Design a protein around this ligand. Structure first.
Ligand SMILES: *CC(=O)N1CCN(C(=O)c2cccs2)CC1
Ligand SMILES: *CC(=O)N1CCN(C(=O)c2cccs2)CC1
Lengths: 304, 304
């Protein structure tokens, strides 16, 4: 019993982290097979970052300008190319620790683990979600760029995020491993405001199921609702609209607890309208939305 | 910027996790050098757990009764002994992945990372604290026993916890790696109630400093207080008494922010007396107490 914000074990990703230096800019890269992936802004001076022309900046860079260090051992760069907002540095050595891996582009509301790194060295691991506004709420200092987000399915690491940007509001923006930003963000030091950070309704419901499974039941009520009625309330509280697809995804947690999804929706509706009244659910005073239904099932079943 | 509940990178500990089976009981063990550490209740039948005599139960066990599997490879057990509530299984092979390590017994209020494992296989990593009542609030299903808690100082893993017990209230009890329980708990299926789960005041103050550093400042007020005045309020709210040692430990965060510790105490006093009024601090609606001053400095400075 007990329910924690849990990250994937980071070892498979720790084995992939390197340092990339271009001129005086040092950040992290991801070494898979004989390719090192890193943010293209590694080539920028702070001057450059105001209005960078990456294709023009890259013309001044050669293979020998990209210094790639794995632990205290230098890697030989034999090629480089820009794909969207990432550089791919071809090296002469396959990473001997390359795990089975995929590159996936996640949807808003999907969760992933971040291995925060500085100078190619892991500092910590934590759980994030792709927010509905395509930001993430991370912990990233200068030098953390090139840190990656991932999911693990048994032995296969699915890389979904690479860190690039902090907005002036202290939230984070990045790319998939093909170098495409999540949302409308650009790797330029310009006016970029995030949209509404809506609550991921299906995740909250998943976490309310987690709470019931773990003995926290005070918020269960005598009510039900409909998707349309619930959605009127979601709208008012800046919750994502709940779809039948979300109901279907919650089916297994419905089955295990015997609480109909729409009954749990009616519990969530009363919590929105009435607040917590100074009570907690799984040690939280607010409604947690960075556990997916898949996360709740995984953690409640002990998947490895 | 941003502040997250962050675990140590787990790779060094992943490399130490094995499966231990005795009869039909399977749990986890920690393989360091040529010793595998595991909870002594691996020798119990569910029957045994009501009033186990471990010395008597152990007489019926031989080296060949302890099945130790590292991945899909069996380890040869050449010796076994009981130290307090752990078994030490001597194996014929040193763990080639043994990190630099220490065994430390932590104090209440100290935080650590847990690598939750099932059948010697890592499922997830999360951050815990030794509670003032010597419980931890973990996420542990059947088969998770022998999972360990740790801190890392650069390249040295300090193991501080091994999971043994869930209390009927859904909180967790375990040992250091010498097999001594934290608090008054015993490895027996008996009436064991936890004491008051008091809030770790020095951790809350650390986390309020983290909040200021990360732009969350609405709770800063025009007041100060004294340790004695603050402690009257701590007592009333089941907070740990604040000592001059706690003030000294918060000195570096005081210095960096320019907020005197006793001024931050007066902010914490108003938050206790007035509540949050539906506001949040670093995405939390309650006062977070599982970051140590050392954790806040580490995460705010980017230590690897
Ligand atoms: C996330 C991270 O490490 N960084 C550092 C790089 N950065 C910059 O502002 C600059 C890029 C090149 C020169 S200065 C973005 C954030
Ligand atoms: C934490 C954990 O994995 N366990 C499983 C073992 N256990 C028992 O109740 C039994 C011990 C031996 C037979 S049954 C404690 C919790």
């Amino acid at each position: 019993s007990g329910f924690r914000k849990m990250a994937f074990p980071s070892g498979k990703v720790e084995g992939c982290m390197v340092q990339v230096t271009c001129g005086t800019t040092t950040l992290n890269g991801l070494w898979l097979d004989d390719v090192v992936y890193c943010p293209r802004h590694v080539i920028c001076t702070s001057e450059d970052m105001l209005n960078p022309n990456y294709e023009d900046l890259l013309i001044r860079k050669s293979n020998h300008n990209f210094l790639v260090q794995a632990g205290n051992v230098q890697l030989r760069v034999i090629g480089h190319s820009m794909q969207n907002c990432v550089l791919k540095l071809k090296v002469d050595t396959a990473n001997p620790k390359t795990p089975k891996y995929k590159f996936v582009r996640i949807q808003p509301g999907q969760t992933f683990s971040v291995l925060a790194c500085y100078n190619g060295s892991p500092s910590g691991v934590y759980q994030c979600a792709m927010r509905p506004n395509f930001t993430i709420k991370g912990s990233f200092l200068n030098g953390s760029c090139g840190s990656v987000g991932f999911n693990i399915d048994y032995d296969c690491v699915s890389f979904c995020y690479m860190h690039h940007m902090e907005l002036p509001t202290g939230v984070h923006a990045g790319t998939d491993l093909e170098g495409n930003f999540y949302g409308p963000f650009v790797d330029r030091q310009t006016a970029q405001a995030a949209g509404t950070d809506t609550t991921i309704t299906v995740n909250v419901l998943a976490w309310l199921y987690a709470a019931v499974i773990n003995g926290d039941r005070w918020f269960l009520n005598r009510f039900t609702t409909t998707l349309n009625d619930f959605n009127l309330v979601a709208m008012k509280y800046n919750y994502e609209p709940l779809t039948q697809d979300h109901v279907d995804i919650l089916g297994p947690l419905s089955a295990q607890t015997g609480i109909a999804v729409l009954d749990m929706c009616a519990s969530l509706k009363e919590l929105l309208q009435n607040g917590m009244n100074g009570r907690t659910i799984l040690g939280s005073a607010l409604l947690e939305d960075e556990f997916t239904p898949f996360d709740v099932v995984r953690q409640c079943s002990g998947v490895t």
